[PDB]
Amino acid sequence: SDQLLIRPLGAGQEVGRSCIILEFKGRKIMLDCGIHPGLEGMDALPYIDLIDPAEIDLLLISHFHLDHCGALPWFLQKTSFKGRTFMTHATKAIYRWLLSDYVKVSNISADDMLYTETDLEESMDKIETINFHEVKEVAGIKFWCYHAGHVLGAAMFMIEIAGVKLLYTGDFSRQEDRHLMAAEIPNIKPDILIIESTYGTHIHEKREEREARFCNTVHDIVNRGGRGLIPVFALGRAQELLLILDEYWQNHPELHDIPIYYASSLAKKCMAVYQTYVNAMNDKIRKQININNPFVFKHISNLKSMDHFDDIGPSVVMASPGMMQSGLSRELFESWCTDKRNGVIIAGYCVEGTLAKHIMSEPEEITTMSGQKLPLKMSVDYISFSAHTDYQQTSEFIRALKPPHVILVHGEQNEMARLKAALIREYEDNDEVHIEVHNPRNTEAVTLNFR
Numbered sequence: 001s002d003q004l005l006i007r008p009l010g011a012g013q014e015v016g017r018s019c020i021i022l023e024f025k026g027r028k029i030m031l032d033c034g035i036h037p038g039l040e041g042m043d044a045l046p047y048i049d050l051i052d053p054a055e056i057d058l059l060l061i062s063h064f065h066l067d068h069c070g071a072l073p074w075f076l077q078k079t080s081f082k083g084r085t086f087m088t089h090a091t092k093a094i095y096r097w098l099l100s101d102y103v104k105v106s107n108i109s110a111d112d113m114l115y116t117e118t119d120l121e122e123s124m125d126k127i128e129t130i131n132f133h134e135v136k137e138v139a140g141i142k143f144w145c146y147h148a149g150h151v152l153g154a155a156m157f158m159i160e161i162a163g164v165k166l167l168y169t170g171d172f173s174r175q176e177d178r179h180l181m182a183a184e185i186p187n188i189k190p191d192i193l194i195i196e197s198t199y200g201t202h203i204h205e206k207r208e209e210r211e212a213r214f215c216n217t218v219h220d221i222v223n224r225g226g227r228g229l230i231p232v233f234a235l236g237r238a239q240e241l242l243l244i245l246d247e248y249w250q251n252h253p254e255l256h257d258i259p260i261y262y263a264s265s266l267a268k269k270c271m272a273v274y275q276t277y278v279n280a281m282n283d284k285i286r287k288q289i290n291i292n293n294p295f296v297f298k299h300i301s302n303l304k305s306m307d308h309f310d311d312i313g314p315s316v317v318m319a320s321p322g323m324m325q326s327g328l329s330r331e332l333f334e335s336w337c338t339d340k341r342n343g344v345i346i347a348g349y350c351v352e353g354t355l356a357k358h359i360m361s362e363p364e365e366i367t368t369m370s371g372q373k374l375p376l377k378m379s380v381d382y383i384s385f386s387a388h389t390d391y392q393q394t395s396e397f398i399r400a401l402k403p404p405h406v407i408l409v410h411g412e413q414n415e416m417a418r419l420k421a422a423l424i425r426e427y428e429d430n431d432e433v434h435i436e437v438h439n440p441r442n443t444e445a446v447t448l449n450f451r
């Protein structure tokens with residue numbers, strides 16, 4: 001009876017630096033390779049010191065988000081890793097520009113930096129692309145992927161080694177939004193399921209209500225003579241927000257005086273690359289792209305930097321990064337926090353150790369990048385558009401697949417415990433169904449015996 005080993009080097013009882021080691025029949029597989037946004041230097045990396053890079057046969061990347069691929073240029077260029085790397089086409093294309101904005105936004109010189117834009121550029125040739133619903137075989141390992149929804153190109157990988165099927169969700173959503181599909185429920189049933197836990201103890205409101213709340217907050221800020229800050233990286237959930245705002249400005253002629261800026265040095269390139277992968281979007285937006293392209297915004301202007309910005313009267317700025325560690329969104333927050341008329345809207349999952357996470361604990365004051373202290377008077381709102389499955393969607397996914405083993409990753413420690421308990425209760429009195437739920441810490445291993 002062969003022994004299957006699953007070990008989180010990252011995202012074990014936390015959100016950040018997703019990296020999961022899978023060991024079975026003389027094969028070593030790594031799932032994702034992200035950084036931790038709430039940490040600095042070598043500490044922001046997964047616990048890579050616990051493995052030998054040269055022994056990794058396969059490296060699979062779920063989606064282009066920094067907490068899943070941010071460490072990838074360091075692992076590909078600055079380690080003994082000689083294995084093969086796979087991404088979907090849209091993920092590889094977006095990976096090149098989000099990481100370029102990331103290195104730009106970053107506040108350190110080449111000495112302290114994990115990698116450069118040249119390392120990122122060079123890492124590209126080392127990455128192979130896979131289509132959805134297509135089998136690839138590497139070192140005896142058979143793999144294919146499903147749609148994850150969540151972000152453009154996001155995949156759920158199914159891995160088969162000697163009759164043993166394992167499904168890794170990456171990050172996923174089971175609802176369609178304006179341009180993305182929902183995640184697929186595989187019909188092939190896995191022995192092991194590795195699933196994200198981000199919003200697993202919560203229940204989503206209607207898309208219509210979240211969109212209305214968001215738009216009403218923005219409108220309320222500009223009405224009172226304020227400027228709206230919406231921190232986001234140029235590629236990710238930002239594309240959904242741009243679609244919502246552009247539609248809202250069309251429906252409200254009394255806002256045609258108020259400008260909307262999508263502020264990023266790479267703004268034009270980001271949108272051009274995004275639009276190249278329309279084939280990976282919803283059926284709705286795929287049919288309408290040649291009728292009226294909604295990605296060709298009527299009310300949103302690009303903005304390269306603070307230098308190209310006339311901060312005269314109310315405006316709405318979408319600026320990188322999302323967690324406001326440094327860069328344009330941090331610069332604008334420092335210029336706008338002291339006026340009570342201004343407002344910040346946080347739309348993503350904020351990780352401990354970031355300004356975005358900090359400002360939600362309602363501080364009296366904040367620290368600038370220069371080191372100074374400023375009073376926090378501007379409003380701070382949290383309206384999530386992070387596109388993660390809620391309890392009903394997680395439960396429904398587990399119930400359709402009924403895998404003997406469920407492994408929780410990518411979630412706050414205490415909420416992951418609560419999710420585990422609820423999944424255990426769901427199958428406690430069921431005699432015909434048997435499911436074992438695990439929630440390992442970083443460096444802890446899940447050991448399973450097969451055959």
Ligand SMILES: CN1CCN(CCOc2c(Cl)cc(C(=O)N[C@@H](Cc3ccccc3)C(=O)O)c(O)c2Cl)CC1
Pocket residue numbers: 035036037038039040041044065066067070105106107231232233234235236237238321322323324325326346347348349350356
């Ligand atoms: C080793 N160090 C180097 C220095 N860095 C600074 C850059 O840190 C980051 C990182 Cl790594 C990732 C994100 C991110 O994934 N962001 C998404 C989602 C989102 C979140 C919140 C709100 C809205 C959206 C988006 O912007 O789409 C981010 O925002 C910041 Cl600030 C830390 C690691």
Ligand SMILES: [Zn+2]
Pocket residue numbers: 063065150151171
């Ligand atoms: Zn994600």
Ligand SMILES: [Zn+2]
Pocket residue numbers: 065067068171410
């Ligand atoms: Zn994630």
